[PDB]
RNA sequence: GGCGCUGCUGCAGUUGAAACGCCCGUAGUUGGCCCCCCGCCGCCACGAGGAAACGGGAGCGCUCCAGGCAGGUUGGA
RNA sequence: GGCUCAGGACAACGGUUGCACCCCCCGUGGCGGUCGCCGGACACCGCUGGCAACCCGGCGCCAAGACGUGCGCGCAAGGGCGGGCCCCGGGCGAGCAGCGUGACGCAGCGACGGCCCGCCCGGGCUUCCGGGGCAUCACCCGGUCGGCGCGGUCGCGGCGCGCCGAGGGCCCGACGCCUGGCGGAGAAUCAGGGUUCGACUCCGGAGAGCGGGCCUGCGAGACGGCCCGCACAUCCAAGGACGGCAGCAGGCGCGGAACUUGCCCAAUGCGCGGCGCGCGGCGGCGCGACGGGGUGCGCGCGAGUCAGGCGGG
């Protein structure tokens, strides 16, 4: 990388998400309904005792394909091993888009896609749809109708193979339409 | 099945092997080794079906037993041995030294060469990786490997090999403007110059070339072997990789009987 | 299978038996054949296996298929072995040379 | 035998699905090791070769204190917590992720160097340290790990509280 | 499978839709008179071969004058028709492939060639002499009555010099 | 196939068989006119990539032929 | 390799993806560092036996490119730490692969040097689109839909188990029932648009009387391998042993309906290595079907007969 870190006078000051993350971890340690203790496999957990700030406290990465990371996942405090940005899974294969059909599961949504079929004898079309279940990271929050882009991953359940990587929101009460794309 | 496949029906054989639909129910199935099963032509189908040195399997075998066939400077004794692109074909009893190239319909031709020519081999750099204890290797299109490779050698380039000592002497860089010949597709056997390398995230990269008479064509980057740098390093058949169209071909088929 | 039998009871038509602690014992049936191992023959006729002369091509056998002893060390076997042994050092000589070669490449790069 | 073929599951709409072949060998399941604490390591021959080590009755393991960077070997004393069930705790069954007490004798020379985690030092002054298993005993025949620290230590101590 | 399972084979004649129709039932025996035809299958066969060249021509003529498929199959079709003598030299355009008939196919049988050349008294005599093996085509002896003679092999019809007739 | 007696192309519904007794109404189907030179679908063309055989199709007198890939520098495009 | 189409309708199959979730013999190309010639014993064979026949017992003298142990310069699996705290070359689109350093362990290769690694063909699973009839089948499902954790697997995954939640599919036809349902490449018909069939040649799947289980091996849930239940048959001194023609010929039965109980591995291919091969070939039966030529012309032929070539194991 030829260019290198321009200078503000506040960067070590804004470096206090370290204390934010530390206290979030200790509150999760004080939560006692939870059966097990959730933490990222990428982080020592001995980094939460030092004070020199020397080393990182949360892990993230970029997935490529021209998709930028969200600050909500960079600065969040949730433990999710199925997140594409802060988890332990990868994106490869197909990337498609659809509308959020339902959002009633834990960290999981249904994406409805629409398409056409040509019947040559009749020289005409019929409109068709399929359902596609997907995993939703806590860094996103969606409702019904919002457009979402989902990318392929390895199996994650009996029905899930895709993962949400972009949400283009749409206002409520809009006229439901075919919207094929 | 419950295991690997040994047999091969004649109809299921590759189309470019030019077998004939009568004359058997079976075909020779190539053996594993230096080349694949689709982009190759076996040794027996070169000797017995092309040059008539043997009129049958039962006497092609013995030609290979007393070790009459040098491939890449080393003998071979397996009738189903897969010889492929750029392999050297020298039989000394009839004083014939060849290299394998493609014709302009996607078939395997044997070009004559000289003793000053059969001293090297062109290979396509398939990939660069790390093995035991952290060492680099280059693996190529002929299933050769070279360790401690010069760092300038990068993936998809071409190397020049000595058949005896097994070491690299020259290398050619795949850039915009290199004389190159295709190996698959429906432009197999045609030669042009790299003048576009268009890349796509996640998916295949496409390559656009042109012959020396203006005709242009496209393919994947998996099918562009590099032969020189604005001049080929090896010999090529007197058609030089220019394809005629169907009517020009038809008049030539008319001439050869006229 | 029906492997049957008995603890040597009634329904035992036929049986096998061996005499210990000896009309009676008077006959001998010779050792039909002879040994055939380099070590074997020597330990047999009270001879070692550590002094450099293991040939022992004496042929008695009482001339009676069945000789051609085994594991008998020779000049040919010795030399051939040495050949392989040495080779399994030359390999590494040139390999560990090439290590330095590539180190120097990088360092000048 | 035991199988993990999906053909015996229903679809995503609840419908019974049909049966179009007989059990294949490449979808076999085996029974699990159920590694008892306190020395056998069986060998299992898997698909294509591939020795798999399958433990029963382990007693020792290699344990690492990371922030101080000290590793010693030690005798697993007792399994005290497990996230799945109380049954695997009550039986002292060695599975990945369970929390155990290890012998303190190996780590007692670290009791000298100060400026260290006092929550580890006062526990070394006793006769055990709290640690987590990081290995899979039924697949590799070994139980190694690290000593707890951070919020995670406090979480498991509160789970162990005299409630 | 035995290797004989892979051989191609095919029917070469088409039977008319309305069989009992007087007006062409009469002009159909007229052709069996003006040549020596055993039965009606040899008129069916001639209609069959005319139908295909007609179909190919209509396909090509749907197309456009500068097009490659015209440039390829029109030249091929005319060359093969001219060398079989179904079409003569002065008509070198595709639109003339439509106005042919059965009769110009029949004209190039051997039974017609040797009657033009006067080698036989008639057509029935020509038939019998054909099967008697007395007329050769250019040094090779041709037993076929239905033989179709290229206008290259048309100068070399004569009695087979191995015959009781020289 | 005849058969436009299954009708997309292309049937019939006053009396031959056949318009729901009527009004409201969701899914579905359909929806005037307008800005051009942006984006995302549909559509049109041209490519790349993957199997022969069959179906077409260039060349070749198994004496013709149903065939076969022959053959006299070749070829199976 | 051969046979068959019974089962199975969001299967399979066809095109189109992926494994940064995997496994693999042979062959090709690499790589090879590992904390003085050993040991006894097995089959063939000798001497004696049991048994109706099936099949075996006891004693003994004898080898290895068979085991076992192992001579050797430390490196198999797994595990702890070693990353950047707007966001973006060993190798990538992608933090992937190596290495270093603290602990464990002692595996594999070595008695004629090979553990190991790339490529290859093959497999497993996997994304998307296509993927029978009935509404006198309108609601359906409950490991069912998602989450956490371990286990098992070559490996991912409700695949399995514990705990938490209440989801998931549906008139764009769910679910259930029926099929005299193998899918595709294809075939029949014929201006154009269409209708119907996909037994069998190639590819893919599935089975070996019907449920199941497994050993050996790189690879099988193998049936010309083994073990058990069921339904059927076979020899037998009555105590016992034993089978799987949906392989080729041939028999029975069924039905309107389908040939020899031949010869050869000479080609084509495969195996191992000059042979073996009911693959595959060559003859026999064969008006299913296809193609060609006669029963005369005005005076010569083919249909048959007998000889010799040619061809053909
Ligand atoms: K996380
Ligand atoms: K679509
Ligand atoms: K669409
Ligand atoms: K679309
Ligand atoms: K579409
Ligand atoms: K529609
Ligand atoms: K799940
Ligand atoms: K699930
Ligand atoms: K709509
Ligand atoms: K099969
Ligand atoms: K397998
Ligand atoms: K196999
Ligand atoms: K075939
Ligand atoms: K064939
Ligand atoms: K082979
Ligand atoms: K042979
Ligand atoms: K199983
Ligand atoms: K089975
Ligand atoms: K299996
Ligand atoms: K009709
Ligand atoms: K019509
Ligand atoms: K009407
Ligand atoms: K009326
Ligand atoms: K009525
Ligand atoms: K009405
Ligand atoms: K109505
Ligand atoms: K109404
Ligand atoms: K209304
Ligand atoms: K209305
Ligand atoms: K609508
Ligand atoms: K409508
Ligand atoms: K509409
Ligand atoms: K309207
Ligand atoms: K379009
Ligand atoms: K093929
Ligand atoms: K059969
Ligand atoms: K079936
Ligand atoms: K059936
Ligand atoms: K194999
Ligand atoms: K093999
Ligand atoms: K799939
Ligand atoms: K899918
Ligand atoms: K799929
Ligand atoms: K589908
Ligand atoms: K229905
Ligand atoms: K449950
Ligand atoms: K699970
Ligand atoms: K459960
Ligand atoms: K539940
Ligand atoms: K339905
Ligand atoms: K049936
Ligand atoms: K229609
Ligand atoms: K039509
Ligand atoms: K049509
Ligand atoms: K019609
Ligand atoms: K019609
Ligand atoms: K048949
Ligand atoms: K079949
Ligand atoms: K088939
Ligand atoms: K087949
Ligand atoms: K097949
Ligand atoms: K198959
Ligand atoms: K099959
Ligand atoms: K099967
Ligand atoms: K079955
Ligand atoms: K059975
Ligand atoms: K069965
Ligand atoms: K079974
Ligand atoms: K089983
Ligand atoms: K079974
Ligand atoms: K059957
Ligand atoms: K049957
Ligand atoms: K037979
Ligand atoms: K009968
Ligand atoms: K009968
Ligand atoms: K043979
Ligand atoms: K046979
Ligand atoms: K005569
Ligand atoms: K005669
Ligand atoms: Mg469609
Ligand atoms: Mg075949
Ligand atoms: Mg009609
Ligand atoms: Mg079908
Ligand atoms: Mg079998
Ligand atoms: Mg039998
Ligand atoms: Mg009957």
mmCIF file of C-alpha atoms (C1' of nucleotides) and ligand atoms in Angstrom, chain A residues 126-127, chain F residues 28-29, ligand 6:
data_model
loop_
_atom_site.group_PDB
_atom_site.id
_atom_site.type_symbol
_atom_site.label_atom_id
_atom_site.label_comp_id
_atom_site.label_asym_id
_atom_site.label_seq_id
_atom_site.Cartn_x
_atom_site.Cartn_y
_atom_site.Cartn_z
ATOM 1 C CA UNK A 126 -45.990 -17.543 -16.507
ATOM 2 C CA UNK A 127 -44.653 -15.781 -13.416
ATOM 3 C "C1'" G F 28 -54.852 -13.581 -10.536
ATOM 4 C "C1'" U F 29 -54.815 -11.188 -15.321
HETATM 5 K K1 LIG H 6 -48.479 -15.406 -14.410
#
